[PDB]
Amino acid sequence: VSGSKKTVVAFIVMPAKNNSFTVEALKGQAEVRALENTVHEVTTSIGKRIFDHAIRYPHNGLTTELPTDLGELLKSSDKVMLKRRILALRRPEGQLPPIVTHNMVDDANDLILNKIRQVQL
Amino acid sequence: VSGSKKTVVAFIVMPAKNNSFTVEALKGQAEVRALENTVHEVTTSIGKRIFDHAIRYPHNGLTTELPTDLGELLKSSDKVMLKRRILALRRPEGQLPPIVTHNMVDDANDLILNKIRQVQLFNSPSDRVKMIFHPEFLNANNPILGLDYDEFVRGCHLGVFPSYYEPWGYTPAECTVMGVPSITTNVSGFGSYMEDLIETNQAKDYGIYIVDRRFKAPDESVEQLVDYMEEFVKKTRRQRIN
Amino acid sequence: RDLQNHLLFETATEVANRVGGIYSVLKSKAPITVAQYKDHYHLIGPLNKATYQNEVFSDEMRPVQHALQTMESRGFVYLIEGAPKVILFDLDSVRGYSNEWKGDLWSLVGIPSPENDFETNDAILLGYTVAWFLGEVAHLDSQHAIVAHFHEWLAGVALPLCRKRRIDVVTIFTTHATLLGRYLCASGDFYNCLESVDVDHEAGRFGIYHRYCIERAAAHSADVFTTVSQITAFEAEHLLKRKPDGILPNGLNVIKFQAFHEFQNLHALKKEKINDFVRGHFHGCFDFDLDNTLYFFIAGRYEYKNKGADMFIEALARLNYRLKVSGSKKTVVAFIVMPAKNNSFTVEALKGQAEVRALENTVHEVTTSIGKRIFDHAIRYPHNGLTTELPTDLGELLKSSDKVMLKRRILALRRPEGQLPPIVTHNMVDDANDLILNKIRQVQLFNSPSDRVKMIFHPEFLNANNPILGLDYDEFVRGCHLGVFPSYYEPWGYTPAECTVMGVPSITTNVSGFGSYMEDLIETNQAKDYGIYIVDRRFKAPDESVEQLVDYMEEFVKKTRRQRINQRNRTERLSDLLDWKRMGLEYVKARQLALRRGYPDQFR
Numbered sequence: 001v002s003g004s005k006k007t008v009v010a011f012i013v014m015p016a017k018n019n020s021f022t023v024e025a026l027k028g029q030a031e032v033r034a035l036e037n038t039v040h041e042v043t044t045s046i047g048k049r050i051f052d053h054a055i056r057y058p059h060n061g062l063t064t065e066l067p068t069d070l071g072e073l074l075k076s077s078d079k080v081m082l083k084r085r086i087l088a089l090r091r092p093e094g095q096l097p098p099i100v101t102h103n104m105v106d107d108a109n110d111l112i113l114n115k116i117r118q119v120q121l
Numbered sequence: 122v123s124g125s126k127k128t129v130v131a132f133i134v135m136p137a138k139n140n141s142f143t144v145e146a147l148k149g150q151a152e153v154r155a156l157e158n159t160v161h162e163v164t165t166s167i168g169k170r171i172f173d174h175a176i177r178y179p180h181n182g183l184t185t186e187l188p189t190d191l192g193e194l195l196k197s198s199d200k201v202m203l204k205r206r207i208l209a210l211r212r213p214e215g216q217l218p219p220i221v222t223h224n225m226v227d228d229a230n231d232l233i234l235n236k237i238r239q240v241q242l243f244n245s246p247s248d249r250v251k252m253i254f255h256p257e258f259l260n261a262n263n264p265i266l267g268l269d270y271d272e273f274v275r276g277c278h279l280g281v282f283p284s285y286y287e288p289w290g291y292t293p294a295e296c297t298v299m300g301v302p303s304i305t306t307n308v309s310g311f312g313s314y315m316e317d318l319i320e321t322n323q324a325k326d327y328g329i330y331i332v333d334r335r336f337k338a339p340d341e342s343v344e345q346l347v348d349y350m351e352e353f354v355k356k357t358r359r360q361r362i363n
Numbered sequence: 364r365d366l367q368n369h370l371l372f373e374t375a376t377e378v379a380n381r382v383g384g385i386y387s388v389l390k391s392k393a394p395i396t397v398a399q400y401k402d403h404y405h406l407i408g409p410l411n412k413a414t415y416q417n418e419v420f421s422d423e424m425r426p427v428q429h430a431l432q433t434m435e436s437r438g439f440v441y442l443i444e445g446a447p448k449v450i451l452f453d454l455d456s457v458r459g460y461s462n463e464w465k466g467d468l469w470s471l472v473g474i475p476s477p478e479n480d481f482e483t484n485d486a487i488l489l490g491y492t493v494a495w496f497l498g499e500v501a502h503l504d505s506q507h508a509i510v511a512h513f514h515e516w517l518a519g520v521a522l523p524l525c526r527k528r529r530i531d532v533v534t535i536f537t538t539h540a541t542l543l544g545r546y547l548c549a550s551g552d553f554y555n556c557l558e559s560v561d562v563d564h565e566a567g568r569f570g571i572y573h574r575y576c577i578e579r580a581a582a583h584s585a586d587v588f589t590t591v592s593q594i595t596a597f598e599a600e601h602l603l604k605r606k607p608d609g610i611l612p613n614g615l616n617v618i619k620f621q622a623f624h625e626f627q628n629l630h631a632l633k634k635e636k637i638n639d640f641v642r643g644h645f646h647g648c649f650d651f652d653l654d655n656t657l658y659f660f661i662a663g664r665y666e667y668k669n670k671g672a673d674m675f676i677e678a679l680a681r682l683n684y685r686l687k688v689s690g691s692k693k694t695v696v697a698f699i700v701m702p703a704k705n706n707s708f709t710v711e712a713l714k715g716q717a718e719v720r721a722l723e724n725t726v727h728e729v730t731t732s733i734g735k736r737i738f739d740h741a742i743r744y745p746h747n748g749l750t751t752e753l754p755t756d757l758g759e760l761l762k763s764s765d766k767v768m769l770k771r772r773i774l775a776l777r778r779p780e781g782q783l784p785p786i787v788t789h790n791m792v793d794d795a796n797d798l799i800l801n802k803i804r805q806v807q808l809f810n811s812p813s814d815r816v817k818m819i820f821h822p823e824f825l826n827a828n829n830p831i832l833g834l835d836y837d838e839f840v841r842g843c844h845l846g847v848f849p850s851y852y853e854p855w856g857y858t859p860a861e862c863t864v865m866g867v868p869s870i871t872t873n874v875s876g877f878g879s880y881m882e883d884l885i886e887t888n889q890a891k892d893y894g895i896y897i898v899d900r901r902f903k904a905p906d907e908s909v910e911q912l913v914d915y916m917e918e919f920v921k922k923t924r925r926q927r928i929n930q931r932n933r934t935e936r937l938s939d940l941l942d943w944k945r946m947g948l949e950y951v952k953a954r955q956l957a958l959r960r961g962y963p964d965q966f967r
């Protein structure tokens with residue numbers, strides 16, 4: 001209502017009978033972790049390209065002290081990787097981030113979860 | 122003359138009397154190291170920005186999976202430090218990369234340096250061959266070229282040992298053991314031994330180049346040595362590797 | 364007509380649409396055919412309205428444009444490395460002519476055509492259309508000799524008539540299997556009692572009758588008849604009642620490295636990724652040495668009998684016994700990569716990778732503090748009472764808090780008492796009824812520590828986007844040591860052929876089209892040294908075949924590293940033989956022979 005731009009992420013840390021973490025929980029952590037590593041790879045090559053330009057300037061037809069076009073730094077193979085990682089992070093259409101990290105033993109009767117489902121958060 | 126795109130950097134590793142490395146040799150390594158570090162900081166920032174875009178797409182007005190404009194990744198403070206690092210690498214106007222890594226004790230009278238000066242290999246940009254005299258034993262403890270001798274050799278493409286007196290060529294032998302082709306002479310004990318075992322035209326293919334310093338005038342020897350060198354420079358990578 | 368400056372028309376169902384294994388063959392072969400024919404080369408296929416958008420003249424070539432115009436006159440769509448020119452005919456824009464045509468066909472050659480056989484329907488439509496098109500060209504172009512190559516029963520409806528209508532163009536037909544062959548190989552002895560089978564009856568019994576005809580017709584109608592491998596030639600002789608004029612083995616578009624030994628480095632790199640996975644999978648039960656461990660794998664479509672999953676698993680159980688008996692210190696981790704119906708990765712799979720990944724991070728932390736301490740000592744010596752150049756007591760470097768976190772990480776890796784590393788990475792939809800898992804359970808390969816052979820079913824396509832084994836298929840292979848593909852029905856072994864190209868030795872069979880090609884080129888004992896192991900599945904009982912397969916695995920396990928390395932070099936040099944640069948010559952020979960047979964202008 002107040003048009004606040006802030007977000008609140010509310011954690012409930014109360015032990016309940018469960019069957020460990022959900023596949024989704026672990027899978028998403030990994031998917032992001034994969035994206036982190038690919039970016040680290042891509043930046044390293046960008047670094048080699050920036051460095052080459054910097055050590056080489058003003059020779060070999062380099063008008064500018066630094067690269068100015070992203071194309072000089074970012075190559076199609078780099079892009080393909082990054083795009084693959086981004087695709088892996090996609091959620092099925094209409095699926096929302098869950099309200100629970102674990103597989104519950106008695107999910108339908110759980111008080112906390114039923115409360116959340118009642119207020120529709 | 123041939124319009125070759127190749128470059129040859131030629132090292133001379135022969136100990137002479139010296140007063141250690143030049144300030145310029147050390148300062149230039151540091152200036153380049155400082156550039157590498159600055160680049161590493163800048164690519165870290167870039168990473169965070171690429172990552173943020175990737176994780177957030179297609180939300181928050183992100184059309185396109187990836188950044189498309191360099192401005193999104195590279196920012197003014199990043200550019201400033203990079204430029205500062207580049208500026209520090211600038212040499213005085215008209216100065217050329219030296220032909221020696223050390224402060225020689227007897228610079229003016231040195232035979233090697235005088236010869237270079239005489240043939241006028243001063244590492245000008247139009248020179249397709251470059252000269253670097255390292256008047257000291259290679260050692261991994263050295264602060265500019267932190268390699269032991271054996272390591273350095275492995276790094277190189279071609280050993281060139283056109284000896285006149287050499288009962289046994291320890292050097293081109295060690296060079297061969299490291300899988301690096303060499304040029305030797307037929308008045309060299311090593312070159313003689315290799316001349317004996319292999320047909321001299323077949324020996325070039327096994328990376329053994331032998332110069333005639335026996336049945337040829339010193340000026341013909343040289344044109345042979347040069348013929349060899351140029352032949353090698355014409356080689357492709359695949360050929361070099363094989 | 365000019366024979367030297369000829370035209371080339373290649374036709375297949377699989378042209379712009381990836382329905383099956385011919386797609387890849389045509390695609391990979393494009394660069395060499397384009398390289399030779401330039402603009403003269405055209406691919407022809409059916410228009411796949413759904414996905415054709417994805418994949419997407421000169422005067423001496425002018426007759427084409429008018430023939431297309433003529434086809435456009437009567438109410439057609441004109442890519443991949445080599446970028447060959449394509450013609451995709453919209454079959455919906457001609458569906459109405461079918462009844463006239465299906466009848467034409469029925470009286471034409473007595474090829475029935477049930478209304479249900481939607482695939483045959485399309486096959487026919489295509490055939491009549493293409494035959495019509497080529498016929499147009501044949502008149503309209505008078506300079507060039509024309510070559511019309513056709514792939515598979517589905518595309519070979521245009522062939523039959525070209526003999527009937529006596530069109531001036533020369534024809535080639537290649538079959539990449541046989542209909543009866545597949546169908547007999549329904550359950551089970553194909554290769555032995557083959558010569559003694561009835562083509563017409565058994566077809567009628569299978570219920571193709573109509574589709575069998577179209578294949579047989581195509582094979583007979585064709586000026587030149589070809590298969591992809593000896594074993595299939597033998598098969599096609601007795602089943603399609605025509606000995607083929609030759610073999611057209613499937614080549615690959617081999618990507619050569621500037622440095623020959625680069626594949627060797629790639630192997631080591633990819634193997635590190637598999638090691639990483641394996642460490643996680645065996646978290647808590649990790650009692651062997653990866654430096655002395657070998658990675659075997661089978662891969663392909665889930666075809667338990669056909670692709671030899673049964674023989675593989677049986678053999679592995681036997682090998683396991685041999686290695687235990689012989690006291691071998693080696694370990695073999697056997698992967699099965701065959702897609703099955705699953706509910707994705709197991710929590711345990713993901714959790715163990717995480718647990719290891721956390722250990723790695725804590726170690727990395729601990730080692731950096733150790734570093735600061737080693738450094739301090741080194742830079743300080745000999746001052747401040749430092750007797751020695753380096754630390755000598757681990758206590759100086761490793762502190763209590765460091766030990767605590769490490770210990771916690773180790774604890775998190777523990778598995779429940781008696782629990783063994785799984786034999787499957789995924790939650791299966793129908794676990795109890797799964798054949799592979801049944802077979803594994805039966806031979807009792809449950810990854811116990813005393814087992815020298817380990818089992819890991821991965822019932823899903825490999826993909827670098829996977830969260831546990833983050834490798835594309837090609838990478839995974841490189842990483843492994845031995846591919847093992849003991850197939851039964853396989854007109855051409857795409858798999859062990861790919862495996863060879865990655866410099867990885869493989870076990871194949873003599874009933875496999877690939878294995879047949881290799882047993883012809885190389886003396887079979889000499890071939891093992893080039894990393895091609897061929898199992899006898901023709902002149903041996905299944906039990907003997909298994910024991911042979913085991914012998915081969917045991918032989919390979921006994922190899923040293925140096926030997927393994929060298930053999931891989933040997934197998935990679937061999938990958939040349941599978942390059943289109945060499946395999947495309949057989950296509951040439953087939954095409955030139957096709958000229959000599961039909962329009963033989965030259966005495967010599």
Ligand SMILES: O=P(O)(O)OC[C@H]1O[C@H](O)[C@H](O)[C@@H](O)[C@@H]1O
Nearest residue numbers: 627628630631634844924927928
């Ligand atoms: O996987 P293996 O058969 O033990 O191969 C091990 C070897 O792989 C490649 O050849 C690497 O270049 C070697 O450094 C490594 O030692």
